[PDB]
Amino acid sequence: HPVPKKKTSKSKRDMRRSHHALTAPNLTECPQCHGKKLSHHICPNCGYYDGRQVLA
Amino acid sequence: PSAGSHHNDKLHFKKGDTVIVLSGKHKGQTGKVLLALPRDQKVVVEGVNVITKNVKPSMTNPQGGQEQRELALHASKVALVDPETGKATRVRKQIVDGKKVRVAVASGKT
Amino acid sequence: MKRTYQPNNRKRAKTHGFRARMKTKSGRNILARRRAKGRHQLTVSD
Amino acid sequence: PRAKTGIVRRRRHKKVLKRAKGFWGSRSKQYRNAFQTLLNAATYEYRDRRNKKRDFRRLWIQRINAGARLHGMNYSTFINGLKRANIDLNRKVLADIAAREPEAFKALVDASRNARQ
RNA sequence: GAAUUGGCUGUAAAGAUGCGGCCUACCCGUAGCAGGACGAAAAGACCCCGUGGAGCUUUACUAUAGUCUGGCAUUGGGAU
RNA sequence: GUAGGGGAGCGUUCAGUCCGCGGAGAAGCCAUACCGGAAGGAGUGGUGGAGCCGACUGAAGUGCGGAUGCCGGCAUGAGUAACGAUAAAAGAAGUGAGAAUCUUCUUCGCCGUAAGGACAAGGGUUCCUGGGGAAGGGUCGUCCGCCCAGGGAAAGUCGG
RNA sequence: GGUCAAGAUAGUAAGGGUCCACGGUGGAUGCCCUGGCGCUGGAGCCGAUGAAGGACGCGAUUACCUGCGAAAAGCCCCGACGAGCUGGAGAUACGCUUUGACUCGGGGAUGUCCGAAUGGGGAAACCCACCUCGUAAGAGGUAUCCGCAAGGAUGGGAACUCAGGGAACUGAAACAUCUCAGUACCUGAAGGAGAAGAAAGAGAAUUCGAUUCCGUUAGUAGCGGCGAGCGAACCCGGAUCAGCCCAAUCAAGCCGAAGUGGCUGGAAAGCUACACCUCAGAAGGUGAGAGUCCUGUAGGCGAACGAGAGGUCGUUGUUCGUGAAACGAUGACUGAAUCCGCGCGGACCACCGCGCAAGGCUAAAUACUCCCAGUGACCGAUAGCGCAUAGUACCGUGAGGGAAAGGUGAAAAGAACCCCGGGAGGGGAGUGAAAGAGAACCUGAAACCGUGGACUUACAAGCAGUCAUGGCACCUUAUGCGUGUUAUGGCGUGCCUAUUGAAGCAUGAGCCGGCGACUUAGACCUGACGUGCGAGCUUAAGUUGAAAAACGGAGGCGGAGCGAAAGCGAGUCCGAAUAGGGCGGCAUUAGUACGUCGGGCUAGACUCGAAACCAGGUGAGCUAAGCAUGACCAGGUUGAAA
Ligand SMILES: [Mg+2]
Ligand SMILES: [Mg+2]
Ligand SMILES: [Mg+2]
Ligand SMILES: [Mg+2]
Ligand SMILES: [Mg+2]
Ligand SMILES: [Mg+2]
Ligand SMILES: [Mg+2]
Ligand SMILES: [Mg+2]
Ligand SMILES: [Mg+2]
Ligand SMILES: [Mg+2]
Ligand SMILES: [Mg+2]
Ligand SMILES: [Mg+2]
């Protein structure tokens, strides 16, 4: 009922999509099993987060 | 879909005859007829080759392998051609068989 | 709500039936016409 | 016999399309829009072609009167005195003569002064 | 239709983002609002036009089912 | 210079004739700064994998931007609105290439003149067992009413 | 050169733009044929010994088609072919075959159930019986309609033919008669053809001689709100040609002439050097382009069995609309002669002339195309039928409607084996000329989605351009006459239609592709040009040849005008002769046939679009009702008659 008036352009649409860039996870090397895991989380690989928690 | 049925699909050669190859590859090379397939105009000769693999996902010692196999051919070949090369024979007659014809060009023996 | 189509075995058959379509000759007209029209099959098999 | 439109329309359209370069968006890409752009393009081409001569007329004048005013004349005065000497049919492109060559235009100004008073 | 799609005032087929002059205005989005895009939807259903159509009506025209009526046919006899 | 009249021509298909070209590559397709008064036509390059220019004459289903025109494909809106009843879920355990969604356990909430049960009509293997994971399932899927195979239906008395 | 000050000036790209390069998406275009289309010719009915069309079955494995049929992808006899075969089928297994399989012709033999269906019922392919034969298994009979009997019919068929019945839109620029048109539609009957036919005629010569068909007469004679419009027949030219009975060669098939070497190539049939056949160079196939490589072709042969009356009233037909309306035809009522007789000749009479009604049969010339063949200035995948097979999918209760559809390679050699992955998918290897063919397999356009590069863009008002100058980059029609991009300046109101007037806040349209609209027909009419003959010019149907065209003078147009006509004539008309209309003479104006084009007329007539109108059918499984037959209304309140 409130329809759009014109096809939006290739340039205008590609302009609107300007902001959709994914923000790549900042990772960090696990101090124990030395594989890359994430801040304030358990290292999925070894299971070690300050000493050791999950059964890996 | 057409397919080799062009001719009256009779066969100029026989299952047992020796034959050489007009044109193609293995030109002049010769061999005994193994399979003569009239409808699809397909001739198996012992001389002409393909080296080819079979697919066993698991079958017959699944352990895949490759074979030595026969190259199946068309009308390009010649029937029992006596003076040591290919020659195109037509004429027929009967000698020791009243129940049968025969063939030659310049000769009389096939 | 309630639809147009209420399937009935002894109805779909008692009318439309090859028997039924043969009962009259405007019917048998429909028959042979349907035949020549390609194979368009009559209700007993439909 | 029947002759379809095959291979004809396409060559035609590509011919049209090809004129289009810095043509923005569908102007350079879709046919109909391109060809259509090339109608108004026709107008501006031909008309502004006849115009460019008006434009350069303007430029040269705009220079000549500048040199003139620099030396104490102006275009009205300078060209008046020039013509007033049957001498100079100089006229055309005299601008650059004023731009590049200072003392020459000084001599033309002085001379055109003589041809006045 | 494609757009790189501001404001006032004026001009234009008489209600301008796209013409003029003047102002304004960095680039791109998100959540919201509905004033404008004479916003979308349905070849206006109003109105008029067409020697267009169809339903109805009657003391418009014309035919007709139906119905009444004279003669002829089946269909005959005698008194008067 | 609009309707309208007149003149010259360009291109496409088929056709007859002429010259011919092609696997050391035809038509078509792609790029291009050249030629021609225009419709147009060449040159070289790149694709392609069988056919095809040129001249002369003849015959047309012969030249598209529009017809809310026809078929097809692909855009916009936009990663938007939605995911189909506000009867809620939760943890453990299992399997698996991968599980919020399958399996089991323990709870929790919902119907209970029903959201339980049994038939009719209609549907037609949807039942069971064993497999599967493309599509179908509004997410997922190891799962299913989906896909594959094999089984299963028994009447002197029930209904005809 | 260090810090203050005042100036100017670059660069960063979140994202955008243009160009280039490389993919992806898609499926246009070119090529091709496995499919269509209509011309000409051929052939042309099947069914109570069971049709057409189907249902269900048959196969070692069977879901679709094909083929069959409880003897089931077949069975037996004869003929041909003479090594293969075991259906489309790609596929394993079992086998069959020179004691001639397969396949091709030719008869028989079996043939479930349904359907005209026909023992009886029935919502087709199902449910129930009876009488014989008898050893069950299993065969046989049981419809009605004609008839002593034998025997015949009920059904089906694309179009064609006759008949019973019989539309409207439309045209008349409205509309009743008219036109559409006896067209469409329904129905009945039948065959390969039908119809029609052997003068109570046509017709004006005391001519002709059955019918049908074509040309022609002829847009004539005529019919008509004398409007729109409708429109003969005789003669003549051809196709083919008969009149008789009665009532007192082509199908299986077989036979067939004549090349090698070298060369490019993956591969040759191409090039080349030499050679050969040809009552055979038409054609397709073979790794590419073919006489001599295969099948064929010209030519040659070829079988047991198989085919070849009158009236009146209401009306109507033909050119015949009530017109002066004859004649045929009937619904009703009437219903004469018969041989010095009887009907006709367009009211009617005489004369004159043709002709014998009230009984039947009757090849050929003709029409059509379900089917088969051959061809094509016919299509080639949005074409051509709708279908490169499908009346399928799919839509509808139904009658009914109704798709898109194609391509590895020359040959499966169709990719073992390795690697990432559950897979999908890809990367190697290998085959192959090519994997720049890999099974989402010919080319692969455009829209549209991306990736990389170049120059660029974050104080700028914009139909996206155009012009001009500068910057940067690139040098294969190409160092300039430049190509790409860009910064600034100047200029600048999309296209189409519709209009007095459009940037329009008027129409249309998302984008690209493909489809898509001024034709065709007639011996029509009238013009322009062109050709051939020319005071003459042409043929039509058809006949005969038919890698070809000739023949065919029936007819048409010139050749004389004038009039209402009879008629007359270089004159004719109106009128009692002089006035005029038309016209010949001209001062001089030749045609006809064919072709292309400009128009006109009749048909859809440039393409698309109606609301509506008519005919035949399909629908009451939705809803409006009827009918027959069943089922249903917890619980509580109130408390009538008697
Ligand atoms: Mg709102
Ligand atoms: Mg609106
Ligand atoms: Mg309107
Ligand atoms: Mg209303
Ligand atoms: Mg136009
Ligand atoms: Mg939004
Ligand atoms: Mg939102
Ligand atoms: Mg899913
Ligand atoms: Mg970025
Ligand atoms: Mg009417
Ligand atoms: Mg009318
Ligand atoms: Mg491809």
Short mmCIF file of N, CA and C in Angstrom, two decimals, chain C residues 3-41:
data_model
loop_
_atom_site.label_atom_id
_atom_site.label_comp_id
_atom_site.label_asym_id
_atom_site.label_seq_id
_atom_site.Cartn_x
_atom_site.Cartn_y
_atom_site.Cartn_z
N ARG C 3 -16.30 -26.80 1.12
CA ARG C 3 -16.01 -26.68 -0.31
C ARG C 3 -17.00 -27.27 -1.30
N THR C 4 -16.85 -26.83 -2.54
CA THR C 4 -17.57 -27.36 -3.68
C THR C 4 -17.48 -28.88 -3.82
N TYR C 5 -16.33 -29.46 -3.49
CA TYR C 5 -16.10 -30.88 -3.80
C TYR C 5 -16.17 -31.90 -2.66
N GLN C 6 -17.23 -32.71 -2.68
CA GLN C 6 -17.48 -33.72 -1.66
C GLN C 6 -17.50 -35.09 -2.30
N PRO C 7 -16.32 -35.72 -2.38
CA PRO C 7 -16.03 -36.92 -3.17
C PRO C 7 -17.01 -38.03 -2.86
N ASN C 8 -17.59 -38.64 -3.88
CA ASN C 8 -18.51 -39.74 -3.65
C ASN C 8 -18.35 -40.87 -4.66
N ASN C 9 -18.10 -42.08 -4.19
CA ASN C 9 -17.80 -43.15 -5.12
C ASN C 9 -18.99 -43.58 -5.96
N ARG C 10 -20.16 -43.62 -5.36
CA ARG C 10 -21.34 -44.09 -6.07
C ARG C 10 -22.04 -42.96 -6.78
N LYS C 11 -21.46 -41.77 -6.71
CA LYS C 11 -21.93 -40.61 -7.48
C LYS C 11 -21.07 -40.38 -8.71
N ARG C 12 -19.78 -40.15 -8.47
CA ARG C 12 -18.78 -39.92 -9.51
C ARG C 12 -18.99 -40.99 -10.56
N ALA C 13 -19.43 -42.16 -10.11
CA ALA C 13 -19.77 -43.28 -10.98
C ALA C 13 -21.18 -43.28 -11.61
N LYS C 14 -22.21 -42.94 -10.83
CA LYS C 14 -23.59 -43.05 -11.32
C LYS C 14 -23.92 -42.02 -12.40
N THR C 15 -23.18 -40.92 -12.39
CA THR C 15 -23.14 -39.98 -13.51
C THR C 15 -21.70 -40.06 -13.96
N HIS C 16 -21.40 -39.55 -15.15
CA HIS C 16 -20.04 -39.56 -15.69
C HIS C 16 -19.53 -40.95 -16.06
N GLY C 17 -20.20 -42.00 -15.58
CA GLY C 17 -19.72 -43.36 -15.79
C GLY C 17 -19.82 -43.77 -17.24
N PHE C 18 -18.89 -44.60 -17.69
CA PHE C 18 -18.94 -45.11 -19.06
C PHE C 18 -20.34 -45.64 -19.35
N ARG C 19 -20.90 -46.36 -18.39
CA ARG C 19 -22.27 -46.85 -18.46
C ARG C 19 -23.21 -45.67 -18.67
N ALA C 20 -23.08 -44.70 -17.78
CA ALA C 20 -23.91 -43.51 -17.82
C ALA C 20 -23.71 -42.76 -19.13
N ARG C 21 -22.46 -42.62 -19.54
CA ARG C 21 -22.13 -41.86 -20.74
C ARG C 21 -22.58 -42.61 -21.98
N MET C 22 -22.89 -43.89 -21.82
CA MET C 22 -23.43 -44.66 -22.92
C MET C 22 -24.95 -44.70 -22.89
N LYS C 23 -25.53 -44.28 -21.77
CA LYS C 23 -26.99 -44.33 -21.60
C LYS C 23 -27.73 -43.47 -22.63
N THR C 24 -27.12 -42.34 -22.99
CA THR C 24 -27.65 -41.46 -24.01
C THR C 24 -26.66 -41.35 -25.14
N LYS C 25 -27.14 -40.93 -26.30
CA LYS C 25 -26.24 -40.85 -27.42
C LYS C 25 -25.55 -39.50 -27.58
N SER C 26 -25.98 -38.49 -26.84
CA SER C 26 -25.18 -37.26 -26.79
C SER C 26 -23.98 -37.62 -25.91
N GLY C 27 -24.23 -38.55 -25.00
CA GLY C 27 -23.19 -39.13 -24.19
C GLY C 27 -22.22 -39.91 -25.05
N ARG C 28 -22.72 -40.88 -25.81
CA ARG C 28 -21.83 -41.68 -26.63
C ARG C 28 -21.12 -40.82 -27.66
N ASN C 29 -21.74 -39.68 -27.97
CA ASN C 29 -21.06 -38.67 -28.76
C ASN C 29 -19.83 -38.23 -28.00
N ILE C 30 -20.03 -37.79 -26.76
CA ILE C 30 -18.90 -37.40 -25.92
C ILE C 30 -17.85 -38.49 -25.90
N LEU C 31 -18.29 -39.74 -25.84
CA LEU C 31 -17.40 -40.89 -25.84
C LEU C 31 -16.50 -40.89 -27.07
N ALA C 32 -17.07 -41.18 -28.24
CA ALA C 32 -16.22 -41.38 -29.40
C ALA C 32 -15.42 -40.11 -29.74
N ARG C 33 -16.01 -38.94 -29.48
CA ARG C 33 -15.29 -37.69 -29.71
C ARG C 33 -14.05 -37.67 -28.84
N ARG C 34 -14.24 -37.98 -27.56
CA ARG C 34 -13.14 -38.07 -26.61
C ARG C 34 -12.09 -39.07 -27.08
N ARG C 35 -12.53 -40.14 -27.74
CA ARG C 35 -11.61 -41.16 -28.24
C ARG C 35 -10.73 -40.59 -29.34
N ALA C 36 -11.35 -40.01 -30.36
CA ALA C 36 -10.57 -39.52 -31.48
C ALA C 36 -9.67 -38.35 -31.07
N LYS C 37 -9.95 -37.78 -29.91
CA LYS C 37 -9.30 -36.54 -29.49
C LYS C 37 -7.94 -36.85 -28.90
N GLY C 38 -7.52 -38.10 -29.06
CA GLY C 38 -6.35 -38.63 -28.41
C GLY C 38 -6.99 -39.53 -27.40
N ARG C 39 -6.22 -40.18 -26.52
CA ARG C 39 -6.86 -41.06 -25.56
C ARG C 39 -7.15 -40.25 -24.31
N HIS C 40 -8.42 -39.94 -24.11
CA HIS C 40 -8.89 -39.17 -22.98
C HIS C 40 -9.90 -40.11 -22.32
N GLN C 41 -9.59 -40.57 -21.12
CA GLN C 41 -10.16 -41.81 -20.63
C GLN C 41 -11.43 -41.52 -19.84
#
